[PDB]
Structure 1
Amino acid sequence: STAIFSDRYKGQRVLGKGSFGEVILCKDKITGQECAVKVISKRQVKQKTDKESLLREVQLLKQLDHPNIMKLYEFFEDKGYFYLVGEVYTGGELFDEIISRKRFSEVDAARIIRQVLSGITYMHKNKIVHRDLKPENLLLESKSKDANIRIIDFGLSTHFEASKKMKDKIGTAYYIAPEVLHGTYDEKCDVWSTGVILYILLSGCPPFNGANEYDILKKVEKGKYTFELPQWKKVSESAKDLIRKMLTYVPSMRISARDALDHEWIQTYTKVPSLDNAILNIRQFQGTQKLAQAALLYMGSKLTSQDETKELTAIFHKMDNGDGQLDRAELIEGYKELMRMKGQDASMLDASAVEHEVDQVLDAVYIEYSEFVTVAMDRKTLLSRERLERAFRMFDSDNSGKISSTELATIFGVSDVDSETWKSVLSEVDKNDGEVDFDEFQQMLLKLCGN
């Protein structure tokens, strides 16, 4: 490949973490067009196919166009990374918008799922399967009332191997089709996933639920679920009929994405009481998923920070007369060497991004390099520490300031943290019971990652 990513685009801001890599807000250096770029590290992510298979799917994906599918513009590849450049959406995740509004009904759910099914139907006609369809992959085009839903990451699971790390697997077991767990699957796995999303939109509870990942997967694999919750009494029988056809265990007997669009419930509710119990259960579910995710990313960032702190200190030690002071030019070289040894960071695309990152640290801090490391490494974790407190405060819906032991079991259950391990961890931080405040919860996570 004779085309460089950094020569055409410049990083502006980090948008978040997606499947297989970080998503950066970028801008074309000539035309000024803003774009979302997913950076996939070749070291941290294995390819399921060859280079020729990936290049041909990317070429197809670039020519495809549907209003409920993300637009892919470009694709780049250097020695250690893949860069998927496409359209940026600012409306956020679909479930984050549902928890904000006070009224939600079957007319809203039908309008949501019709968009999702139009996108899936279109992508299935072009022989492209998602496999990992879940609410996080449903983004809203803009912060508007009539904001369309854009499905992201279509086709990536065919070419990139799924992560085994829980910080990347969180919230996926609820939506995965049984045939995907056993290896023989086709496009019908995306109808199952949509069916699960539809079940959560109308009730606020996953149909296959459990206290941990393996318990959820056991339920999925058995394939049995009920409509025995009181909230289903308020919902129509045609909605229940569609879910039954979408959550049909044998994929050949399961409804297609196309035939799901012609279903009576779609055509009737896109041409009625508000589900108030569903909104309260989606709000609770979203808060729980986001706090467990923030806890895992907080522990990861603390481990990444400890490794990078000690590695950067050794680089500045070898570069030092002995007094412990270094110049701006030396600090940039030592910082650039940290990326050459531990891979390029998603936030810093080129040498200019590193030069400005050192300038931002030196604004706060011949300068003491031990002081520079402390500040520079706290800026790498800033997003993970603040997101944890924000996620703890959002989860604490009644603003009591604490979370019960029952909520800790549910949070640590979704994080796959062993019950006996976290129960032993709270006794060391708080000896004398039943609940923890944010400081104690943060102290528990610090002890769970060797601190």
Structure 2
Amino acid sequence: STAIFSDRYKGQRVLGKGSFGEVILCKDKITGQECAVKVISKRQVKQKTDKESLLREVQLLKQLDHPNIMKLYEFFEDKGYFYLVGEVYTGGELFDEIISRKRFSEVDAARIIRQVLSGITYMHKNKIVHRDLKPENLLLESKSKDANIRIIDFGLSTHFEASKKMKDKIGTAYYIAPEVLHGTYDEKCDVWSTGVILYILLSGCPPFNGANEYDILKKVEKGKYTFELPQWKKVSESAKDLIRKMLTYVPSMRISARDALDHEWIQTYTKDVPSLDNAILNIRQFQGTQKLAQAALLYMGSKLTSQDETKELTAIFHKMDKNGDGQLDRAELIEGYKELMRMKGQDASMLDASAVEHEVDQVLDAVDFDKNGYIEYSEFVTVAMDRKTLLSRERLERAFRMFDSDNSGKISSTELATIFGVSDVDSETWKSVLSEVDKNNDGEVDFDEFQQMLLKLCGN
């Protein structure tokens, strides 16, 4: 008989959203082992391969072992989902840690890139390609400072189709190898992606850039880039030589991961070296922008999900309310909330019956109602839904504050252009919405105004 994920694991909390699914911090019900589970919804993510081929890849991945590669422990599958259980890392994304440091030299970059190349080299030896390598897939193992980089998502993109949705696409275009765009690719695509990441570590700007996703993709496909920016004047010849070799257009002429590890630049800088201050500055701006556009798309999504789940939940309860007096008990609210999850797939957070009981009790305990009596469902619906959004509403706010590095209270129109370009919101569409909110021609918006624009960009 098939083994069941929630027989073995309980959810602690959501860690975040990555490629193909939500990632949840889980705990083994017997051993207390904490793990990070990536939950992939079959409704939302299509498979590329047969079951057979996926099972064999999983089995291989459970056996592979390298210090710069996320350890996979278990794999489960049921009717609606795939569950990929792996080791928890607590150090967060590499670039998030880099923006927090006072100095950053080529030696720091070389030590980072060596780790990435070492992980990749090993995976290539095992005939596993990443293809979607980017900064978000480089996690630090712990929150220490000599912490190792662990690369996540190796092998996934071969078996599951990427989302076409921008909220899931943010960041992808800078890093993708040109040959991946055209369909004929091999493991060399991962060296290209690393070259891009390295270019960014040493200058703070993407080598291939543009005002929207398609403009970025157009630059990538032409494959041309330069080292003419001022901050390249501070950088060694050997680093630009390696970059050139990694960003070589024709894959057969591009350096391999293994050979890159032997490059002069890696050798010299990983065994009287200035800080790259202008690069740190550009990376923190790049990062903040990426994080705010991401938060803007999630917020818009969250509002739409709420509009959808509010009405669904009310209809479920109306139906359930046989007598029609507006009064359900706690087990009924639970059955209805379950009914909502049965219909939805959005909550990886509500893995089993027991997580749903708990969530109901959280809402009741907020709403000043006794859990042992009968309850007005319309009031319960109102509180339950804010719970889900405000997470995104307060993360939106948090992300607006982090982007506003000067504590000015405002985002300029130029900055909005940048943010919406990354978010791939049409230029005349956002300006139009900004016209409707900025009637004083300040050419800038505060947080509430920004939020209002986003509500207008999602049909509110």
Q: Verify same fold: TM over 0.5.
A: yes
Q: Is 1:332 aligned to residue 341 of structure 2? A: no
Instruction: Give the secondary-structure state (helix, strand or coil) at the position aligned to 2:251.
Output: coil
2: distance between equivalents of 1:258 and 1:381? Answer: 46
The alpha-carbon deviation at position 343 of structure 1 amounts to 2.9
User: 1:86-123 CA distances to partner (integer Å, 9 max, x unpaired)?
Assistant: 00000000000000001000000000000000000000
The alpha-carbon deviation at position 357 of structure 1 amounts to 0.5
The alpha-carbon deviation at position 326 of structure 1 amounts to 1.3
2: distance between equivalents of 1:9 and 1:218? Answer: 45
The alpha-carbon deviation at position 5 of structure 1 amounts to 0.2
Q: CA RMSD, aligned part only?
A: 0.8
Instruction: Give the secondary-structure state (helix, strand or coil) at the position aligned to 1:310.
Output: helix
Instruction: Give the secondary-structure state (helix, strand or coil) at the position aligned to 1:174.
Output: helix
Instruction: Give the secondary-structure state (helix, strand or coil) at the position aligned to 1:184.
Output: coil
User: 1:380-407 CA distances to partner (integer Å, 9 max, x unpaired)?
Assistant: 1122111110110000011100010000
2: distance between equivalents of 1:426 and 1:137? Answer: 34
Instruction: Give the secondary-structure state (helix, strand or coil) at the position aligned to 2:103.
Output: coil
**Aligned residue for 2:138?**
138
The alpha-carbon deviation at position 426 of structure 1 amounts to 1.4
Change (3 A) 1:229 1:55: same
Moved more, 392-401 or 378-387: 378-387
What does 1:342-381 correspond to in 2, within 5 Å?
342-343=344-345, 345-365=347-367, 366-381=374-389
Moved more, 313-322 or 44-53: 313-322
Change (3 A) 1:34 1:86: same
User: 1:115-163 CA distances to partner (integer Å, 9 max, x unpaired)?
Assistant: 0000000000000000000000000000001100000000000000011
Q: Is 1:393 aligned to residue 401 of structure 2? A: yes
1: distance between equivalents of 2:345 and 2:91? Answer: 32
* Count of residue correspondences: 451
User: 1:287-341 CA distances to partner (integer Å, 9 max, x unpaired)?
Assistant: 0000000000000000001000000000111111222121111100110001112
Instruction: Give the secondary-structure state (helix, strand or coil) at the position aligned to 1:85.
Output: strand
**Aligned residue for 2:237?**
237
The alpha-carbon deviation at position 344 of structure 1 amounts to 6.4
2: distance between equivalents of 1:382 and 1:14? Answer: 15
**Aligned residue for 2:457?**
448
1: distance between equivalents of 2:444 and 2:175? Answer: 31
User: 1:70-96 CA distances to partner (integer Å, 9 max, x unpaired)?
Assistant: 000000000110000000000000000
Change (3 A) 1:344 1:419: closer
2: distance between equivalents of 1:334 and 1:357? Answer: 13
Change (3 A) 1:344 1:426: closer
Moved more, 19-28 or 344-353: 344-353
Gaps of 5+ in 1: none
1: distance between equivalents of 2:288 and 2:114? Answer: 26
2: distance between equivalents of 1:317 and 1:402? Answer: 44
2: distance between equivalents of 1:67 and 1:156? Answer: 19
The alpha-carbon deviation at position 60 of structure 1 amounts to 0.1
Instruction: Give the secondary-structure state (helix, strand or coil) at the position aligned to 1:158.
Output: helix
Moved more, 337-346 or 314-323: 337-346
Moved more, 277-286 or 380-389: 380-389
Moved more, 376-385 or 94-103: 376-385
What does 1:24-173 correspond to in 2, within 5 Å?
24-173=24-173
**Aligned residue for 2:442?**
433
The alpha-carbon deviation at position 427 of structure 1 amounts to 2.0
1: distance between equivalents of 2:74 and 2:196? Answer: 32
The alpha-carbon deviation at position 29 of structure 1 amounts to 0.5
The alpha-carbon deviation at position 218 of structure 1 amounts to 0.2
Extract structure 1 runs of 4+ deviating beyond 6 A: none
Instruction: Give the secondary-structure state (helix, strand or coil) at the position aligned to 1:210.
Output: coil
The alpha-carbon deviation at position 429 of structure 1 amounts to 2.4
2: distance between equivalents of 1:430 and 1:115? Answer: 48
Instruction: Give the secondary-structure state (helix, strand or coil) at the position aligned to 1:375.
Output: helix
Moved more, 358-367 or 438-447: 358-367
The alpha-carbon deviation at position 430 of structure 1 amounts to 2.8
Moved more, 321-330 or 293-302: 321-330
User: 1:44-74 CA distances to partner (integer Å, 9 max, x unpaired)?
Assistant: 0000000000000000000000000000000
2: distance between equivalents of 1:341 and 1:268? Answer: 57
Moved more, 101-110 or 428-437: 428-437
Instruction: Give the secondary-structure state (helix, strand or coil) at the position aligned to 1:252.
Output: helix
2: distance between equivalents of 1:382 and 1:32? Answer: 30
**Aligned residue for 1:414?**
422
The alpha-carbon deviation at position 367 of structure 1 amounts to 1.6
Instruction: Give the secondary-structure state (helix, strand or coil) at the position aligned to 2:172.
Output: coil
**Aligned residue for 2:432?**
424
Gaps of 5+ in 2: 368-373
2: distance between equivalents of 1:89 and 1:262? Answer: 28
Moved more, 379-388 or 257-266: 379-388
